[PDB]
Write a new protein. Structure first.
Lengths: 412, 412
């Protein structure tokens, strides 16, 4: 058998706020974090907007010297991790440090640092490249730097599954705990691809909404006028903890992580299949993992990227998995407000899923003024919806057809 | 409840060969794959050699049309995965495709591709960035593209844990199978970091051997005259399979994967602790996972990177874990010949560890002319050593203090 896993700590940077409570306040009020990108020449760019982290003060976490060594994506992940550990009340000791590990991931990693060192390399040659270039840019350094700062000696690793990273990181962190390899994990993702290469890279595949005139209306999941996703920056981190360990120290328990599903589409490199057959296997895999019937599910935090193919596949997948219960559950895209944090999407959407359990409220899908063909589900258009939520799903479907589902249940 | 996991297929690109048997012949013959780099101009670089893959034909595997869109690390990963799958004899069907997944990882991923696109952006503008920049560079697309070409709908993901990536990728794929999420996984890693930023960033950190006038003698693990690691390119892939599923189809079984350990040093971003404390915790986790007496270990494929700190830390970790039996087992670093394939190091060295079991031979540490202070173990100096091997161990240690150990034994 298997150990139960609870959420005792959460931390976040998002386009809505510099922590969980501020972010969640924006989500429930349907506020957008999307705005034209600043201190950056986007003249030659079809997209000039996204969700930036506004007002981040790294010196709340690190000395200036330590922050100078680390890509913004690493900074954002340490921030959410430090918040989550502090939010949990956990005390690390010689007696438990071998049982506390970290799995913080990223989709794309250190593009901002890769750019600035590229500038150096091309202008002046190799001897101007930072000595800290490699360890300050690679994706396993949020786990690395966190483990070194707090003295964590348990499982130490990093996932990179594109837009599925956050969901995969939390899910496989839960497995470490359930099968007795750890009592505590910090898990989630961080991302800062709002650079030239990120905007350019996604710009060149014309993946991005180009609604420059109305940045707050660009992200419109399931709306007939959607024209691709909105690039956003940030981090989410959860403290996952074995239930008996959490109870023994009297932890505040937000919710229980009951299920994790994974699937591969084996379809296309960036597009999901029109019927969402891969997202459907993943959700069924996640429900079976939790020993739950589809009928027991109340809330889904969609991937809901605002791409023509993605949004429609997810409707197909939900109708397929949930049959005559598909209208009864509420499903919303918090990306209507946050845009798409890529590797960190799944981490902040796990937190929104946990807070939907705490607060008994479905976050809105904003900008859903004209549901597309067959988008006739309860997508919680425009405003938040109080309702009963025992069981909440969080879905992520990424490049390479990599799928993740997390199942959270109310704990009392 | 926990199932057993065997190896039924292996695949490789190394500086010694374009497959396993060719690579392994070089290993047993003590041949160096290290040579001055020809694919770029390094006269401005303090290090000008590495373990290049020689004469790779991507069109043994993929269309030139697809190949052109993919960073070499992805081409190298697919090449290794296709070999391993072929070598397995496995036929993907509707009956088994949901039960076959992939976990192929990388330390750094498509730096070459990110660099070249960066050069396009800075010299020409954002409009010259490939539309294939993101899907052709990000680390999870080895898992993604393999799943699409072969129709694998099992768990689909990628680790990035720096120089531990290969060992972790293989260990965790075994856990997928062990605990019922899959019956088959293609697992390992791939790296092509030999670009300006790669050789530049490792150079800026003074991590690399600067023995430009004798590259075949650069990599000399435990030798008193070692001066840093040698940067190499390539890929390893293994087909991991549930034992009864392997029996059920009359699979040829190279060996059984009985043990996997992880730990964190929680010490330093790039430096290992001189006492090998985190490495010791990791091997002990692995031996306890395998239910072994540490005296059962016959062969250790060491991380053996040829850095001053790394090499001596490993000796300490192995004396601390094995006590007097540390003087009975054989330990060698095939990095003496291949150099350090970073995130692929663990994947090719897992294969060397399995072939050590098949052939009953300890591969040599070449260039070990003058063992350093305290390096008094059986390090298989100079020449392969025929000997009884029932249990083989493969260690990796990375930036962020992240440790991985795999335990193989003969299967009958
Ligand atoms: C028991 N561990 C397990 C089980 C299923 C999937 C993944 C893992 S992992 C990567 O954490 O090793």
């Amino acid at each position: 058998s298997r150990r139960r896993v609870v959420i005792t700590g959460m931390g976040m940077l998002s386009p809505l706020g510099l922590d969980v409570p501020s972010s969640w306040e924006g989500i429930l009020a349907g506020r957008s974090g999307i705005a034209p990108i600043e201190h950056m020449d986007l003249s030659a760019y079809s997209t000039r907007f996204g969700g930036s982290v506004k007002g981040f003060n790294v010196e709340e976490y690190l000395s200036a010297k330590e922050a100078r060594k680390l890509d913004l994506f690493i900074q954002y992940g340490l921030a959410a991790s430090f918040q989550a550990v502090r939010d949990s009340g956990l005390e690390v000791t010689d007696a438990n440090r071998e049982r506390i590990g970290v799995s913080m991931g990223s989709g794309i990693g250190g593009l901002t640092n890769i750019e600035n060192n590229c500038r150096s390399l091309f202008e002046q040659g190799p001897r101007r490249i930072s000595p800290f270039f490699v360890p300050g840019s690679i994706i396993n350094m949020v786990s690395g730097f966190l483990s070194i700062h707090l003295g964590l000696q348990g499982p130490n690793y990093a996932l990179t599954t594109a837009q599925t990273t956050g969901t995969h990181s939390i899910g496989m962190a839960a497995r470490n705990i359930a099968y007795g390899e750890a009592d505590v994990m910090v898990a989630g993702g961080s991302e800062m691809a709002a650079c030239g290469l990120g905007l350019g890279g996604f710009g060149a595949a014309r993946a991005l909404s180009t609604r420059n005139d109305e940045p707050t209306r660009a992200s419109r999941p399931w709306d007939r006028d959607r024209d691709g996703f909105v690039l956003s920056d940030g981090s989410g981190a959860l403290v996952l903890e074995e239930l008996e360990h959490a109870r023994a120290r009297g932890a505040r328990i937000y919710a229980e992580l009951v299920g994790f599903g994974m699937s591969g589409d084996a379809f296309h490199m960036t597009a999901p299949p029109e019927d969402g057959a891969g997202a459907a296997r993943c959700m069924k895999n996640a429900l079976r993992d939790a020993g739950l019937d589809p009928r027991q599910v109340d809330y889904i935090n969609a991937h809901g990227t605002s791409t023509p193919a993605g949004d429609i596949a997810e409707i197909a997948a939900v109708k397929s998995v949930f049959g005559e219960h598909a209208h009864a559950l509420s499903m919303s895209s918090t990306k209507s407000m946050t845009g798409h944090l890529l590797g960190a999407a799944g981490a902040v959407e796990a937190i929104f899923s946990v807070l939907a359990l705490r607060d008994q409220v479905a976050p809105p899908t904003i900008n859903l003024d004209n549901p597309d063909e067959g988008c006739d589900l309860d997508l919680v258009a425009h405003e938040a919806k109080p309702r009963k939520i025992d069981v909440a799903l969080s879905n992520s479907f990424g490049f390479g057809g990599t799928n993740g589902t997390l199942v959270f249940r109310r704990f009392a």
